[PDB]
DNA sequence: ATCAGAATCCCGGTGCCGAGGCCGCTCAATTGGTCGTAGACAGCTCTAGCACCGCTTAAACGCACGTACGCGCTGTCCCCCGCGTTTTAACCGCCAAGGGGATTACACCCAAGACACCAGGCACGAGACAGAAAAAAACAACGAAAACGGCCACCA
C-alpha cells in the first residue's frame, strides 16, 4: 500500500522541504522514493543536497458502469477502478455527458454496476451541471440530494490550482469511500495557462507529475480516474489505460472507439445522449 | 609694403574741493596702589605609542594585447558683431514734507549671586541578540556566437 510521506519527515528531513514536497503533489514515500533526483531539484527552493537527502532516507523506508449497455459491453463492463481511462474526441461528443453520468453510476450498488462510492468531480471549464447528476439519480432511482451530497465539487481556475487540489483530495479520500474522480477539460488549463512555445516544458513537466499523482491516487485508494482531452500528447499514453476516440454522429447519438488498450479489442460502440443519462442508442 | 582713418597719448591751461593744517577742549589713557587667583612649576602615575619579529596572503606590479577614444581635418550654416538710426528715460537740479532715528530721562523686573538640597544622570556590570561572517545558492547579467531573418543585387 501507500507509505504517507509524514514518516519521511521523521528519516530528518525538515519540514518545510516535505510541507514543498506534498505542494509539488508527492504524499508518500514511495511516491518520492521511485522518482530521480530533477523531480525534486526542479521544485522551486530545493538544491541537488535537499533531493539527495530525500532520496536516501526514503529509500530506506520504501467495474463502474457507463448507463450505456453498449459502451459498458464496449469497456467488458466499465471503467476499472483503480486505473485512469482517457477519452480524446472532438467537440460536443459528451464527454462532459458521460462524467456528469458516471458521477452518478458511481455511487450504484456494485451488483448495478456501481462502485458503492462517493463521486469526485474536478472542473476546469464550468459545465458541471448538479441538475445533470439529478437527472441520473432519477434514472436509476436514487437520491438526487443524496447523489449532491455524495459528489464534492471545485472547480480548478489554473494548472498549478489543479494540482493543488489533489492534496485536498488525498486526504479528504482517507475519510470517506469514493469511487470516482472526474477531471474535465483536464488538458484545456495547460493549453490556456501554458500557450507560448518556450514554455511548453513547464506544462509538460507539470502535466507529467500530475498524471503520475493521478495513477498513485488510483492505485491508492482503488478509485476510477477520468480525465477528459479536447482534441481540436504520447505523454499520456502511458498514464492513460484505456484510450476511447470520440466522435459526433448527427443528431445526438455519439460513436464511441477504443484506440488503444492492452487487455480491451479495438472495437466500436453506438450510444446516445439522453436527458436521464448516457443512454445506449434507440433508433 | 602702403596708406588712410580712427584711436590713443601727450602737453598745456583752468578750476575746484578735498586734503592738510591749526586751535580749542575733554575724556581716555596713565600712574600708583590694593587684592584675589590662575597658571607656573614640581612631582607622581601609568597609558599608550613606538619598536620589533614572524607568519600569511592579498594587493601591487610588469607585461601582452586589443580597441575605443582623443585629436586633427572639412564642410556648413547661423547668429553675433559692428555700424547706422530712432527713441526714451537716466540723470541733474530743485523743492517739500514728514517720519523715523537719535537723545534724554525715568522706572522696574529680571538676572547674577549665594545658599541649601537632592535626584537624575553617569561608570560599571551583565546578558543577549542583530548582524558579521561564511557558505551555499540563486541568479542576473554580459556577451560570443550562432541562427534566423530580413534586406538587397541581377536580371529574368
Do not use: W
Amino acid at each position: 500500500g501507500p507509505q504517507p510521506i509524514s514518516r519521511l519527515e521523521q528519516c530528518g528531513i525538515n519540514a518545510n522541504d516535505v510541507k514543498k514536497l506534498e505542494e509539488a503533489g508527492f504524499h508518500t514515500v514511495e511516491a518520492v522514493a521511485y522518482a530521480p533526483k530533477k523531480e525534486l531539484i526542479n521544485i522551486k527552493g530545493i538544491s541537488e543536497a535537499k533531493a539527495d537527502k530525500i532520496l536516501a532516507e526514503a529509500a530506506k523506508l520504501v467495474q463502474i458502469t457507463t448507463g450505456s449497455k453498449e459502451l459498458d459491453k464496449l469497456l467488458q463492463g466499465g471503467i476499472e477502478t483503480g486505473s485512469i481511462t482517457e477519452m480524446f474526441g472532438e467537440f460536443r461528443t459528451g464527454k462532459t455527458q458521460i462524467c456528469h453520468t458516471l458521477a452518478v453510476t458511481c455511487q450504484l450498488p456494485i451488483d448495478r454496476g456501481g462502485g458503492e462510492g462517493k463521486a469526485m468531480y474536478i472542473d476546469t471549464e464550468g459545465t458541471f451541471r448538479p441538475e445533470r447528476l439529478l437527472a441520473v439519480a432519477e434514472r436509476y432511482g436514487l437520491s438526487g440530494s443524496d447523489v449532491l451530497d455524495n459528489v464534492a465539487y471545485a472547480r480548478a481556475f489554473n494548472t498549478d490550482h489543479q494540482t493543488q487540489l489533489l492534496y485536498q483530495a488525498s486526504a479528504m479520500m482517507v475519510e470517506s469511500r469514493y469511487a470516482l474522480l472526474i477531471v474535465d477539460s483536464a488538458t484545456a488549463l495547460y493549453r490556456t495557462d501554458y500557450s507560448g512555445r518556450g514554455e511548453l516544458s513547464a506544462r509538460q513537466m507539470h502535466l507529467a507529475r500530475f498524471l503520475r499523482m493521478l495513477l498513485r491516487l488510483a492505485d491508492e485508494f482503488g478509485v476510477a480516474v477520468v480525465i477528459t482531452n479536447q482534441v481540436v500528447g504520447n505523454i499520456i499514453a502511458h498514464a492513460s489505460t484505456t484510450r476511447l476516440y470520440l466522435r459526433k454522429g448527427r443528431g445526438e447519438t455519439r460513436i464511441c472507439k477504443i484506440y488503444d488498450s492492452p487487455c480491451l479489442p479495438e472495437a466500436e460502440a453506438m450510444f446516445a445522449i439522453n436527458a436521464d443519462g448516457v443512454g445506449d442508442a434507440k433508433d
